[PDB]
Coordinates of C-alpha atoms in Angstrom, one line a residue:
Chain W
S574 CA 43.9 21.5 -8.5
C575 CA 40.7 21.2 -6.3
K576 CA 41.1 18.8 -3.3
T577 CA 37.5 17.6 -3.7
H578 CA 37.3 14.9 -6.5
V579 CA 33.8 13.5 -5.6
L580 CA 31.0 15.4 -4.0
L581 CA 28.5 13.1 -2.4
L582 CA 25.2 15.1 -2.2
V583 CA 22.6 13.4 0.1
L584 CA 19.0 14.3 -0.4
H585 CA 17.7 13.6 3.1
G586 CA 13.9 13.2 3.2
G587 CA 13.5 10.8 6.2
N588 CA 11.4 7.7 6.1
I589 CA 7.7 7.1 5.2
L590 CA 6.5 7.6 8.8
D591 CA 8.1 11.0 9.3
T592 CA 5.8 14.0 9.6
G593 CA 5.9 17.7 10.0
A594 CA 9.0 19.8 10.5
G595 CA 12.0 17.6 10.8
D596 CA 14.6 18.0 13.6
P597 CA 17.5 19.5 11.7
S598 CA 19.9 18.1 14.2
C599 CA 18.6 14.6 13.4
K600 CA 19.4 15.0 9.7
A601 CA 22.9 16.4 10.6
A602 CA 23.4 13.6 13.1
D603 CA 22.7 11.0 10.3
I604 CA 25.1 12.7 8.0
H605 CA 27.8 13.0 10.7
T606 CA 27.5 9.3 11.4
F607 CA 27.7 8.5 7.7
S608 CA 30.7 10.8 7.2
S609 CA 32.5 9.0 10.1
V610 CA 32.0 5.6 8.5
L611 CA 33.3 7.0 5.2
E612 CA 36.4 8.3 6.8
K613 CA 37.1 5.0 8.7
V614 CA 36.6 2.8 5.6
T615 CA 38.7 5.2 3.5
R616 CA 41.6 5.0 5.9
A617 CA 41.5 1.3 6.2
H618 CA 41.3 0.5 2.5
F619 CA 41.1 3.5 0.1
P620 CA 43.9 5.8 1.3
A621 CA 44.1 7.4 -2.1
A622 CA 40.7 8.8 -1.4
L623 CA 41.5 10.4 1.9
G624 CA 40.6 14.1 1.9
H625 CA 39.1 13.9 -1.6
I626 CA 35.5 12.9 -1.0
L627 CA 33.2 15.4 0.6
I628 CA 29.6 14.9 1.8
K629 CA 26.9 17.6 1.7
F630 CA 23.2 17.2 2.4
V631 CA 20.0 18.7 1.4
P632 CA 16.9 18.6 3.7
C633 CA 13.8 17.6 1.8
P634 CA 10.2 18.2 2.7
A635 CA 8.3 15.5 4.6
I636 CA 6.0 14.6 1.8
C637 CA 4.3 11.8 3.8
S638 CA 2.7 14.0 6.4
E639 CA -0.8 14.1 5.1
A640 CA -0.6 10.4 4.1
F641 CA 0.5 9.5 7.7
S642 CA -2.6 11.2 9.1
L643 CA -4.9 9.3 6.7
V644 CA -3.4 6.0 7.4
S645 CA -3.4 6.6 11.1
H646 CA -7.1 7.4 10.9
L647 CA -7.9 4.2 8.9
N648 CA -6.3 2.0 11.6
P649 CA -8.9 -0.4 13.0
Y650 CA -7.0 -0.7 16.3
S651 CA -7.3 1.6 19.3
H652 CA -4.6 4.3 19.3
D653 CA -3.8 7.8 20.7
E654 CA -4.1 11.1 18.9
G655 CA -1.5 11.4 16.2
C656 CA -0.2 7.8 16.7
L657 CA -0.1 4.4 15.0
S658 CA -0.6 1.2 17.1
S659 CA 2.2 -1.3 17.3
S660 CA -0.5 -4.0 17.4
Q661 CA -1.4 -3.3 13.8
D662 CA 0.9 -5.9 12.2
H663 CA -0.2 -5.1 8.7
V664 CA -0.3 -1.3 8.9
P665 CA -0.6 -0.3 5.2
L666 CA 2.9 1.2 4.9
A667 CA 2.9 0.8 1.1
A668 CA 0.0 3.3 0.9
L669 CA 2.2 6.1 2.4
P670 CA 4.5 6.7 -0.7
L671 CA 1.6 6.2 -3.0
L672 CA -0.6 8.8 -1.2
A673 CA 2.5 11.1 -1.0
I674 CA 3.2 11.2 -4.7
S675 CA -0.4 11.4 -5.7
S676 CA -0.9 14.8 -3.9
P677 CA -1.3 17.8 -6.2
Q678 CA 1.4 19.4 -4.1
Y679 CA 4.0 16.7 -4.7
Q680 CA 5.4 18.5 -7.7
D681 CA 6.1 21.6 -5.5
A682 CA 8.2 19.4 -3.2
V683 CA 10.3 18.4 -6.1
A684 CA 10.8 22.0 -7.2
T685 CA 11.8 22.9 -3.6
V686 CA 14.4 20.1 -3.5
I687 CA 15.9 21.3 -6.8
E688 CA 16.2 24.8 -5.4
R689 CA 17.8 23.8 -2.2
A690 CA 20.2 21.4 -3.9
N691 CA 21.4 24.1 -6.3
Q692 CA 21.9 26.5 -3.4
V693 CA 24.0 23.8 -1.5
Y694 CA 26.0 23.1 -4.7
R695 CA 26.7 26.8 -5.2
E696 CA 27.9 27.4 -1.7
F697 CA 30.2 24.4 -2.1
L698 CA 31.6 25.9 -5.3
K699 CA 32.4 29.1 -3.4
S700 CA 33.9 27.3 -0.5
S701 CA 37.7 26.6 -0.2
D702 CA 36.9 22.9 -0.6
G703 CA 35.1 23.6 -3.9
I704 CA 37.2 26.2 -5.7
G705 CA 38.1 24.8 -9.1
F706 CA 35.9 21.7 -8.7
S707 CA 35.9 19.5 -11.8
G708 CA 35.0 16.2 -10.3
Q709 CA 31.9 14.0 -10.1
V710 CA 28.7 14.7 -8.1
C711 CA 27.0 11.5 -6.9
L712 CA 23.5 11.7 -5.5
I713 CA 22.3 9.7 -2.5
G714 CA 18.6 9.5 -1.7
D715 CA 17.3 8.1 1.5
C716 CA 13.9 6.4 1.7
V717 CA 11.8 9.5 0.9
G718 CA 14.6 11.7 -0.5
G719 CA 15.3 9.0 -3.2
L720 CA 11.8 9.6 -4.5
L721 CA 12.3 13.3 -4.9
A722 CA 15.8 12.9 -6.2
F723 CA 14.6 10.5 -9.0
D724 CA 11.8 12.8 -10.1
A725 CA 14.2 15.7 -10.1
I726 CA 16.5 14.1 -12.7
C727 CA 13.9 12.2 -14.8
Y728 CA 13.1 12.9 -18.5
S729 CA 11.1 11.3 -21.3
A730 CA 12.4 9.1 -24.2
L731 CA 10.2 22.7 -12.2
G732 CA 13.8 23.6 -13.1
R733 CA 16.8 21.3 -12.9
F734 CA 19.9 20.6 -10.8
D735 CA 22.8 22.8 -11.8
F736 CA 25.1 19.8 -11.9
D737 CA 25.3 16.6 -13.9
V738 CA 24.8 13.5 -11.8
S739 CA 27.2 10.5 -12.0
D740 CA 26.2 7.7 -9.6
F741 CA 22.8 7.8 -8.0
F742 CA 22.5 5.6 -4.8
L743 CA 19.1 4.9 -3.2
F744 CA 18.8 3.8 0.4
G745 CA 15.7 1.6 0.9
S746 CA 13.4 3.7 -1.2
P747 CA 10.0 2.5 -2.4
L748 CA 10.6 4.0 -5.9
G749 CA 9.5 0.7 -7.6
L750 CA 6.0 0.9 -6.1
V751 CA 5.7 4.6 -7.2
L752 CA 6.7 3.7 -10.8
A753 CA 4.3 0.8 -10.8
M754 CA 1.5 3.2 -9.9
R755 CA 2.5 5.7 -12.6
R756 CA 2.6 3.0 -15.2
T757 CA -0.8 1.8 -14.1
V758 CA -2.4 5.3 -14.5
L759 CA -0.6 6.4 -17.7
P760 CA 0.5 3.2 -19.7
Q761 CA 10.2 5.6 -21.4
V762 CA 11.0 7.8 -18.4
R763 CA 14.7 7.4 -17.4
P764 CA 16.9 9.3 -15.0
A765 CA 19.8 11.5 -16.1
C766 CA 22.7 9.9 -14.3
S767 CA 25.5 7.5 -15.2
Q768 CA 24.1 4.6 -13.0
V769 CA 21.3 3.8 -10.5
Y770 CA 22.2 1.6 -7.5
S771 CA 19.1 0.7 -5.4
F772 CA 19.9 -0.8 -2.0
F773 CA 17.4 -2.7 0.1
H774 CA 17.1 -5.2 2.9
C775 CA 14.7 -7.9 1.7
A776 CA 12.7 -7.5 4.9
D777 CA 12.4 -3.7 4.7
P778 CA 8.7 -2.8 4.1
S779 CA 9.9 -0.3 1.4
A780 CA 12.1 -2.8 -0.4
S781 CA 11.0 -2.7 -4.1
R782 CA 12.8 -4.0 -7.1
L783 CA 13.4 -1.8 -10.1
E784 CA 14.9 -4.2 -12.6
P785 CA 11.7 -6.0 -13.5
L786 CA 10.1 -2.6 -14.4
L787 CA 12.7 -2.2 -17.1
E788 CA 12.7 -5.9 -18.1
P789 CA 10.0 -8.2 -16.5
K790 CA 12.0 -11.4 -16.7
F791 CA 14.5 -9.9 -14.3
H792 CA 12.0 -10.8 -11.5
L793 CA 13.5 -14.3 -11.9
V794 CA 17.1 -13.0 -11.6
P795 CA 18.2 -12.6 -8.0
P796 CA 19.3 -9.1 -6.8
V797 CA 23.0 -8.7 -6.5
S798 CA 24.2 -9.6 -2.9
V799 CA 26.3 -6.7 -1.5
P800 CA 29.4 -8.2 0.2
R801 CA 29.7 -7.9 4.0
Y802 CA 32.6 -5.6 4.8
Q803 CA 33.6 -7.8 7.7
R804 CA 34.5 -10.7 5.4
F805 CA 35.1 -8.9 2.0
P806 CA 36.5 -5.5 2.8
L807 CA 37.9 -5.2 -0.7
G808 CA 34.7 -6.7 -2.4
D809 CA 34.1 -10.1 -3.8
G810 CA 35.4 -9.5 -7.3
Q811 CA 32.0 -9.4 -9.1
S812 CA 31.7 -7.3 -12.3
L813 CA 28.2 -6.0 -11.5
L814 CA 27.6 -5.6 -15.3
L815 CA 24.2 -6.1 -16.8
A816 CA 25.9 -7.9 -19.7
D817 CA 27.0 -10.6 -17.3
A818 CA 23.5 -11.2 -16.1
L819 CA 22.2 -11.3 -19.7
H820 CA 24.9 -13.7 -20.7
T821 CA 24.5 -16.0 -17.8
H822 CA 20.7 -16.1 -18.2
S823 CA 20.7 -15.9 -22.0
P824 CA 17.8 -18.3 -22.5
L825 CA 15.5 -16.0 -20.6
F826 CA 16.4 -12.8 -22.4
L827 CA 17.9 -13.8 -25.8
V828 CA 17.7 -8.1 -30.7
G829 CA 16.9 -8.9 -27.1
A830 CA 20.2 -8.0 -25.5
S831 CA 20.5 -4.7 -27.3
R832 CA 16.9 -3.6 -26.5
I833 CA 17.3 -4.3 -22.8
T834 CA 20.8 -2.7 -22.7
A835 CA 19.5 0.4 -24.3
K836 CA 16.7 0.9 -21.8
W837 CA 18.8 0.1 -18.7
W838 CA 19.8 2.9 -16.3
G839 CA 23.5 2.4 -16.7
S840 CA 25.7 -0.5 -17.6
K841 CA 25.6 -2.2 -14.1
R842 CA 22.9 -4.0 -12.2
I843 CA 20.3 -1.8 -10.3
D844 CA 18.9 -4.1 -7.5
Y845 CA 21.3 -4.6 -4.6
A846 CA 20.3 -6.6 -1.5
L847 CA 22.0 -6.0 1.8
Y848 CA 22.7 -8.4 4.6
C849 CA 20.1 -7.9 7.3
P850 CA 21.0 -8.7 10.9
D851 CA 18.3 -10.9 12.5
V852 CA 17.8 -8.4 15.3
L853 CA 16.2 -5.9 12.8
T854 CA 13.5 -8.5 12.0
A855 CA 12.4 -8.9 15.7
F856 CA 10.5 -5.6 15.7
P857 CA 6.9 -4.7 15.1
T858 CA 6.0 -3.2 11.7
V859 CA 5.6 0.4 12.8
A860 CA 9.3 0.5 14.1
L861 CA 10.8 -0.9 10.9
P862 CA 10.9 2.2 8.6
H863 CA 13.1 4.1 11.2
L864 CA 15.3 1.1 12.0
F865 CA 16.0 0.4 8.3
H866 CA 16.5 4.1 7.6
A867 CA 19.0 4.5 10.5
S868 CA 20.9 1.3 9.4
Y869 CA 22.3 3.0 6.2
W870 CA 24.1 5.8 7.8
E871 CA 26.3 3.4 9.8
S872 CA 26.6 0.6 7.2
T873 CA 30.2 -0.3 6.3
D874 CA 28.7 -2.7 3.7
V875 CA 27.1 0.3 1.8
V876 CA 30.0 2.7 2.3
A877 CA 32.6 0.2 1.0
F878 CA 30.4 -0.4 -2.0
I879 CA 30.1 3.3 -2.7
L880 CA 33.8 3.8 -2.5
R881 CA 34.5 0.9 -4.9
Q882 CA 32.2 2.6 -7.5
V883 CA 33.9 6.0 -7.4
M884 CA 37.3 4.5 -8.3
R885 CA 36.7 4.1 -12.1
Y886 CA 37.1 7.9 -12.1
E887 CA 40.5 7.9 -10.3
Chain I
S620 CA -48.1 -11.9 -1.9
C621 CA -44.5 -12.7 -2.9
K622 CA -42.7 -15.2 -0.6
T623 CA -39.4 -13.3 -0.9
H624 CA -39.3 -10.3 1.4
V625 CA -35.6 -9.5 1.3
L626 CA -33.2 -10.3 -1.6
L627 CA -29.6 -10.5 -0.5
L628 CA -27.5 -9.7 -3.6
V629 CA -23.8 -10.6 -3.2
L630 CA -21.3 -9.0 -5.4
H631 CA -18.5 -11.6 -5.3
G632 CA -15.2 -10.2 -6.5
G633 CA -12.8 -12.4 -4.5
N634 CA -9.9 -11.1 -2.5
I635 CA -7.0 -8.8 -3.4
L636 CA -4.7 -11.7 -4.3
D637 CA -7.1 -13.3 -6.8
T638 CA -6.2 -13.2 -10.5
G639 CA -7.4 -14.2 -13.9
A640 CA -10.7 -16.1 -14.6
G641 CA -12.2 -17.2 -11.3
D642 CA -13.4 -20.7 -10.6
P643 CA -17.2 -20.3 -10.8
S644 CA -17.7 -23.3 -8.6
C645 CA -15.6 -21.5 -5.9
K646 CA -17.9 -18.5 -5.9
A647 CA -20.9 -20.8 -5.8
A648 CA -19.4 -22.8 -3.0
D649 CA -18.9 -19.6 -1.0
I650 CA -22.5 -18.7 -1.5
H651 CA -23.8 -22.1 -0.7
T652 CA -21.9 -22.1 2.6
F653 CA -23.2 -18.6 3.4
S654 CA -26.8 -19.7 2.5
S655 CA -26.5 -22.7 4.8
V656 CA -25.4 -20.5 7.7
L657 CA -28.3 -18.2 7.0
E658 CA -30.8 -21.1 7.1
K659 CA -29.4 -22.5 10.4
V660 CA -29.4 -19.2 12.2
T661 CA -32.8 -18.4 10.8
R662 CA -34.3 -21.7 12.2
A663 CA -32.7 -21.2 15.6
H664 CA -33.7 -17.6 16.2
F665 CA -35.7 -15.9 13.4
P666 CA -38.4 -18.4 12.4
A667 CA -40.5 -15.6 11.0
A668 CA -37.9 -15.2 8.3
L669 CA -37.8 -18.8 7.2
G670 CA -38.4 -19.0 3.5
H671 CA -38.5 -15.2 3.0
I672 CA -34.9 -14.3 2.5
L673 CA -33.2 -15.3 -0.7
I674 CA -29.5 -15.0 -1.7
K675 CA -28.3 -14.4 -5.2
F676 CA -24.8 -13.6 -6.4
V677 CA -23.1 -11.7 -9.1
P678 CA -19.5 -12.6 -10.2
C679 CA -17.4 -9.6 -10.5
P680 CA -14.2 -9.2 -12.6
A681 CA -10.9 -9.8 -10.8
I682 CA -9.7 -6.2 -11.0
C683 CA -6.5 -6.9 -9.1
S684 CA -4.9 -9.1 -11.7
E685 CA -2.5 -6.6 -13.2
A686 CA -1.7 -5.2 -9.7
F687 CA -0.8 -8.7 -8.5
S688 CA 1.7 -9.1 -11.4
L689 CA 3.4 -5.8 -10.6
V690 CA 3.6 -6.5 -6.8
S691 CA 4.9 -9.9 -7.5
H692 CA 7.6 -8.5 -9.7
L693 CA 8.6 -5.9 -7.1
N694 CA 9.2 -8.6 -4.5
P695 CA 12.9 -8.5 -3.3
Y696 CA 12.7 -12.2 -2.2
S697 CA 13.3 -15.2 -4.4
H698 CA 10.0 -16.6 -5.9
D699 CA 8.7 -18.8 -8.7
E700 CA 6.9 -17.5 -11.8
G701 CA 3.5 -16.0 -11.1
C702 CA 4.0 -16.4 -7.3
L703 CA 4.5 -14.4 -4.1
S704 CA 6.9 -15.6 -1.4
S705 CA 5.6 -16.4 2.0
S706 CA 8.9 -15.1 3.4
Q707 CA 8.0 -11.6 2.4
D708 CA 6.3 -10.6 5.7
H709 CA 5.5 -7.1 4.6
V710 CA 4.3 -7.8 1.0
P711 CA 2.7 -4.5 0.0
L712 CA -0.9 -5.8 0.1
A713 CA -2.3 -2.2 0.4
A714 CA -0.9 -1.4 -3.0
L715 CA -3.2 -3.9 -4.7
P716 CA -6.5 -2.1 -4.3
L717 CA -4.8 1.2 -5.1
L718 CA -3.3 -0.1 -8.3
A719 CA -6.6 -1.8 -9.2
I720 CA -8.8 1.3 -8.9
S721 CA -6.2 3.5 -10.6
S722 CA -6.3 1.5 -13.9
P723 CA -8.0 3.3 -16.8
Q724 CA -10.1 0.1 -17.2
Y725 CA -11.4 0.1 -13.6
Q726 CA -14.5 2.1 -14.7
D727 CA -15.3 -0.7 -17.3
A728 CA -15.3 -3.3 -14.5
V729 CA -17.9 -1.2 -12.6
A730 CA -20.1 -0.9 -15.8
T731 CA -19.8 -4.7 -16.2
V732 CA -20.9 -5.3 -12.6
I733 CA -23.9 -3.1 -13.0
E734 CA -24.9 -5.0 -16.2
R735 CA -24.6 -8.4 -14.6
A736 CA -26.4 -7.4 -11.4
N737 CA -29.3 -6.0 -13.5
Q738 CA -29.5 -9.3 -15.4
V739 CA -29.5 -11.3 -12.1
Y740 CA -32.2 -9.1 -10.7
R741 CA -34.4 -9.4 -13.8
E742 CA -34.2 -13.2 -13.8
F743 CA -35.1 -13.1 -10.1
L744 CA -38.2 -10.9 -10.9
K745 CA -39.3 -13.5 -13.5
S746 CA -38.7 -16.5 -11.2
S747 CA -41.5 -18.0 -9.1
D748 CA -39.6 -16.8 -6.0
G749 CA -39.7 -13.2 -7.4
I750 CA -43.1 -12.7 -9.0
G751 CA -44.7 -9.7 -7.3
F752 CA -41.6 -8.8 -5.4
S753 CA -42.1 -5.6 -3.3
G754 CA -39.4 -6.1 -0.6
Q755 CA -36.0 -4.9 0.2
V756 CA -32.7 -5.5 -1.8
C757 CA -29.6 -5.5 0.4
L758 CA -26.2 -5.5 -1.2
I759 CA -23.3 -7.5 0.1
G760 CA -19.8 -6.9 -1.2
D761 CA -16.8 -9.1 -0.4
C762 CA -13.3 -7.8 -0.2
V763 CA -13.1 -6.7 -3.9
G764 CA -16.8 -6.8 -4.8
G765 CA -17.4 -4.2 -2.1
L766 CA -15.2 -1.7 -4.0
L767 CA -17.2 -2.2 -7.2
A768 CA -20.5 -2.2 -5.4
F769 CA -19.7 1.1 -3.7
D770 CA -18.7 2.8 -6.9
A771 CA -21.8 1.5 -8.6
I772 CA -24.1 3.3 -6.2
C773 CA -22.1 6.5 -5.5
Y774 CA -23.2 10.0 -6.5
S775 CA -22.1 13.6 -5.8
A776 CA -23.5 16.1 -3.3
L777 CA -21.9 3.8 -16.6
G778 CA -25.5 3.1 -15.9
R779 CA -27.1 2.2 -12.6
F780 CA -28.6 -0.7 -10.8
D781 CA -32.3 -1.3 -11.6
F782 CA -33.1 -1.6 -7.9
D783 CA -32.9 0.7 -4.9
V784 CA -30.5 -0.6 -2.3
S785 CA -31.5 -0.7 1.4
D786 CA -28.7 -2.1 3.5
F787 CA -25.2 -2.4 2.1
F788 CA -22.8 -4.8 3.9
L789 CA -19.1 -4.9 3.3
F790 CA -17.0 -7.9 4.1
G791 CA -13.4 -6.9 4.9
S792 CA -13.1 -4.5 2.1
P793 CA -10.3 -1.9 1.7
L794 CA -12.7 0.9 0.7
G795 CA -11.3 3.3 3.2
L796 CA -7.9 3.2 1.6
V797 CA -9.3 3.8 -1.9
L798 CA -11.3 6.8 -0.7
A799 CA -8.3 8.2 1.0
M800 CA -6.4 8.0 -2.3
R801 CA -9.3 9.7 -4.1
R802 CA -9.4 12.5 -1.6
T803 CA -5.7 13.0 -1.9
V804 CA -5.8 13.3 -5.7
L805 CA -9.0 15.4 -6.0
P806 CA -9.5 17.3 -2.7
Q807 CA -19.3 14.9 -0.9
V808 CA -19.5 11.5 -2.6
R809 CA -22.0 9.3 -0.8
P810 CA -23.6 5.9 -1.6
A811 CA -27.3 5.6 -2.5
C812 CA -28.4 3.1 0.1
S813 CA -30.2 3.2 3.5
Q814 CA -27.1 2.2 5.5
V815 CA -23.5 1.1 5.1
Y816 CA -22.2 -1.6 7.5
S817 CA -18.5 -2.2 7.1
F818 CA -17.2 -5.4 8.8
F819 CA -13.5 -6.1 9.4
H820 CA -11.3 -8.1 11.6
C821 CA -8.8 -5.7 13.1
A822 CA -5.9 -8.0 12.0
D823 CA -7.1 -8.3 8.4
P824 CA -4.6 -6.5 6.1
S825 CA -7.6 -4.9 4.2
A826 CA -9.2 -3.6 7.5
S827 CA -9.9 0.1 6.9
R828 CA -12.1 2.4 8.9
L829 CA -14.6 4.6 7.1
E830 CA -16.0 6.7 9.9
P831 CA -13.0 8.9 10.2
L832 CA -13.3 9.8 6.5
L833 CA -16.7 11.3 7.3
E834 CA -15.7 12.9 10.6
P835 CA -12.0 12.7 11.5
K836 CA -12.5 12.7 15.3
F837 CA -14.2 9.3 14.9
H838 CA -10.7 7.8 14.8
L839 CA -10.8 8.1 18.6
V840 CA -14.2 6.4 18.9
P841 CA -13.8 2.6 18.9
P842 CA -15.5 0.6 16.1
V843 CA -18.6 -1.2 17.2
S844 CA -17.9 -4.8 18.5
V845 CA -20.1 -7.3 16.8
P846 CA -21.4 -9.8 19.4
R847 CA -20.3 -13.4 19.2
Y848 CA -23.3 -15.5 18.3
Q849 CA -22.1 -18.3 20.7
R850 CA -22.7 -16.0 23.6
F851 CA -25.3 -13.5 22.3
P852 CA -27.4 -15.2 19.7
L853 CA -30.0 -12.5 20.1
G854 CA -27.6 -9.6 20.1
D855 CA -26.3 -7.6 23.0
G856 CA -29.1 -4.9 23.0
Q857 CA -27.0 -2.1 21.6
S858 CA -28.8 0.6 19.5
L859 CA -26.0 1.0 16.9
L860 CA -27.2 4.6 16.4
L861 CA -24.8 7.4 15.4
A862 CA -26.7 9.7 17.7
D863 CA -25.7 7.5 20.7
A864 CA -22.0 7.8 19.8
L865 CA -22.3 11.6 19.3
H866 CA -24.2 11.9 22.6
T867 CA -21.7 9.7 24.6
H868 CA -18.7 11.5 23.1
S869 CA -20.3 15.0 22.9
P870 CA -17.2 16.9 24.0
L871 CA -15.3 15.6 21.0
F872 CA -18.0 16.5 18.4
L873 CA -20.2 19.2 20.0
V874 CA -24.2 22.8 14.7
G875 CA -21.7 19.9 15.0
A876 CA -24.2 17.2 15.6
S877 CA -26.4 18.2 12.6
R878 CA -23.5 18.5 10.2
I879 CA -22.1 15.1 11.1
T880 CA -25.5 13.5 11.0
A881 CA -26.2 15.0 7.6
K882 CA -23.1 13.6 6.0
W883 CA -23.3 10.1 7.6
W884 CA -24.2 7.1 5.4
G885 CA -27.3 6.2 7.4
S886 CA -28.4 6.7 10.9
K887 CA -26.3 3.8 12.4
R888 CA -22.6 3.3 12.9
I889 CA -20.5 2.2 9.9
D890 CA -17.4 0.5 11.4
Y891 CA -17.9 -3.0 12.9
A892 CA -15.1 -5.1 14.3
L893 CA -15.5 -8.8 14.3
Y894 CA -14.1 -11.3 16.8
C895 CA -10.9 -12.8 15.4
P896 CA -9.9 -16.4 16.4
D897 CA -6.2 -16.5 17.3
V898 CA -5.6 -19.2 14.8
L899 CA -6.2 -16.7 11.9
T900 CA -3.3 -14.6 13.2
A901 CA -0.8 -17.5 13.1
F902 CA -0.4 -17.4 9.3
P903 CA 2.0 -15.6 7.0
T904 CA 0.9 -12.4 5.3
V905 CA 0.3 -13.9 1.8
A906 CA -2.2 -16.4 3.3
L907 CA -4.3 -13.8 5.1
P908 CA -6.5 -12.3 2.3
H909 CA -7.9 -15.7 1.5
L910 CA -8.3 -16.8 5.1
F911 CA -10.1 -13.6 6.1
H912 CA -12.2 -13.7 2.9
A913 CA -13.3 -17.3 3.5
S914 CA -14.2 -16.5 7.2
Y915 CA -17.2 -14.3 6.2
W916 CA -19.2 -17.0 4.4
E917 CA -19.3 -19.3 7.5
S918 CA -19.6 -16.5 10.1
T919 CA -22.6 -16.9 12.4
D920 CA -21.5 -13.6 14.0
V921 CA -22.0 -11.8 10.7
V922 CA -25.2 -13.7 9.6
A923 CA -27.0 -13.1 12.9
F924 CA -26.1 -9.4 12.7
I925 CA -27.5 -9.2 9.1
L926 CA -30.7 -10.9 10.2
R927 CA -31.2 -8.4 13.1
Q928 CA -30.9 -5.5 10.7
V929 CA -33.6 -6.7 8.3
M930 CA -36.2 -6.9 11.0
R931 CA -37.1 -3.2 11.1
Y932 CA -38.9 -4.0 7.8
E933 CA -41.0 -6.9 9.2

């Protein structure tokens, strides 16, 4: 009945250097660009999806504001008020998410995200495109929004989203570092979703693997290489299944297989490395969080990958 | 009576990438190199100090071991067991001190350092060089040892050192980042010493200013430039006093002057930037913590500076 089969809900929190009140047009511009890539890839190769996948977004609070001010005041190099210096090659970017999630007010940002996402979902259900919706809701979190999205669906084994999450995609999010901090302070939390797919460019300062936090020996298993759309528009035929990694690397892991499988966040691999044009690596450190953030919204590699995953429901 | 007028006690904890049991000969080699620089500068320009300044060291625990393992397992790049990859330009070095001090066992490392320092001090007092000692004890902390040394002398306004600390020198220590984390979680702690001098090379990944944590507008006052011994073996004649910075930058700060002066850690500036040979900047990120760590023990710039400070007691 309903024309929308899959709702892609984007939790847009910006990147680790964003501060203050965001520009709402900037968030909408990101989503418009992403939506145009989705439509183009859909027409070229997934015509059965045309008109059936809808994108909505949720603006998240900029939880790195105070952390940015502290890091900027720690900078040994000369700089102007409210600024970093591009000469600081090793600006401590990894401290920004850690300071952000350590704030006593971080939990309030999570509660706010849940409230805004439920309002967006409810308006969708009343809209013409949402009447009679019975499909899948996938979550997409950007660099910072991914952190909030994860904490919003996590449980042990503030309210809650009004929907059940199927696929959960993370765009260059430093979640791994955050979870390493939380394990250090308080030494299983798992997300309530059908699968986690965490994308990163290896050279992104926020690139953080999650698989070795579930099973440490995965640090010796390479991340999955996402196929370049230009060469493999239909994918490269790889199964993506955890069981294939366990089977191929059985000496490393193998009760072993069942214990790892039980604690995994889905039946597929979690760590996905994206092809990184060499141009992106020619920039000073302070420019990289925005450049990597912006890359996702126009990535045909990422969009084609997402589309392939939502076809087991067709 | 006693031939030793100043005891320089070095808390040697290594750098943020050190793990496991240290090589004791390595720590002793560092201290021997430092001691030889001290003797050479002393003979050239402080002959009244010859034979009257003694160096002792205290090996500290390698509190970054577990953090190193986590960061190494987060690395998106291919690497070997127990290793970082030099291709990871933005390895999250800033996470290492933060994970280290967040461990529930960090407080036990501080207690252990206090115990070992008191044993070293007691053996010194029994030695021929220490009988009748009535002089000053200065503390020197290296990158990691500085963190432990600071927490050992801090109080609000585990045991304690058996001595009172005069000057406290920090060699490229990420204390500022640690204190920014602690202020974020629990939003005055001050060290029990006559003065803090925190040295850094601007390009050192652990370089972190402390002055803006005491007074935020100091982020717009440059750190003090340490004179190069090659050109200014006797110093450049600068007072180093906080009051001179407040006076010269009075519009920024000025009850203001008295409140800032009261919360400062001594009467002198705290942030000291060292000249950095360009060679040190030609190295990949994973090599920099050791290279910067090693630089201090052979630095005539640092040694001449230290010697000038211990002359107000002559």
